[PDB]
């Protein structure tokens, strides 16, 4: 499986999830099962935690190719979480069994997608650039913010989500958007 788009809407009111199953000839039997949303408070290593933020079952929406593609637009204010200072973790699962000719490693039933609001980072960069316009000196806080973002990106890409949570809570938690 894979994500088509996974972002918070530009108006900071919806959390957009658009999932699809991969198009190979050996995934015809594989469908989509459920979508589970977790935050930086409830996240756990081994799969979605108990008491998640938002559980979604795909059978309910549809009445077979329809179940291979799913799109959602979750009003974040209905989830009772802050769109500015929240790190959503989106798990997806597959109610299927791939063929026997599946190459080794491609039969991964679960995926994960981390979401943050990019608006506060954009505004912070604009503030730092405005400060740079005065006397053409780069603030050290600006380089710090850039490198801390790169650290969180590396933590996400290597799968080390808890240390990414520590960095996010410690460095980027207070955000205005």
């Amino acid at each position: 499986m894979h994500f088509n788009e996974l972002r918070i809407s530009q108006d900071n009111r919806f959390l957009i999830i658009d999932v699809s199953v991969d198009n190979q000839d050996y995934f015809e039997d594989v469908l989509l099962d459920s979508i589970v949303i977790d935050t930086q408070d409830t996240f756990v290593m081994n799969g979605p935690s108990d008491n998640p933020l938002y559980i979604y079952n795909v059978e309910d929406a549809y009445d077979t190719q329809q179940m291979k593609n799913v799109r959602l637009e979750l009003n974040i204010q209905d989830l009772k979480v802050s769109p500015c200072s929240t790190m959503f973790f989106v798990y997806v699962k597959s109610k299927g069994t791939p063929s026997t000719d599946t190459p080794c490693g491609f039969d991964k039933d679960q995926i994960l997608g981390t979401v943050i609001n990019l608006q506060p980072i954009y505004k912070q960069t604009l503030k730092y650039l405005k400060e740079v316009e005065c006397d053409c000196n780069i603030p050290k806080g600006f380089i710090d913010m850039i490198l801390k973002l790169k650290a969180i990106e590396l933590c996400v890409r290597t799968g080390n989500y808890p240390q990414a949570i520590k960095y996010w809570n410690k460095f980027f938690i207070k955000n205005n958007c």
Partner: protein, 107 residues
């Protein structure tokens, strides 16, 4: 886990490789190793039935204080395909130059 085993084995092999090359390693790091494999045997034994998910969160977040603390212990790598900003591969396909009462339309 199957991974705390790997981390502990790698950590102690690095420990004894260091004790082979040099004749010394900081005991402040031997302490980290002791904590690490004590946790590994704690979680892979008869005492893993006392662990809630809150306890799991706390144990993991306490273990990642040991991650880059020394050269024996490294940051584990898991099989991940995510990132903070994702790519949008959706395609635009309008219908015969049509629009709804307020906005555009596609297939």
């Amino acid at each position: 886990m199957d991974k705390m085993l790997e981390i502990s084995e790698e950590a102690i092999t690095r420990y004894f490789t260091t004790l082979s090359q040099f004749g010394y390693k900081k005991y402040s790091d031997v302490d980290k190793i002791i904590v690490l494999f004590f946790m590994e045997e704690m979680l892979a034994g008869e005492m893993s039935y006392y662990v809630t998910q809150d306890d799991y969160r706390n144990i993991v977040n306490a273990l990642y204080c040991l991650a880059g603390s020394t050269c024996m212990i490294d940051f584990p790598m898991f099989e991940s395909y995510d990132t903070l900003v994702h790519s949008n591969n959706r395609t635009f396909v309008p219908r015969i130059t049509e629009d709804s009462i307020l906005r555009s339309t596609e297939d």
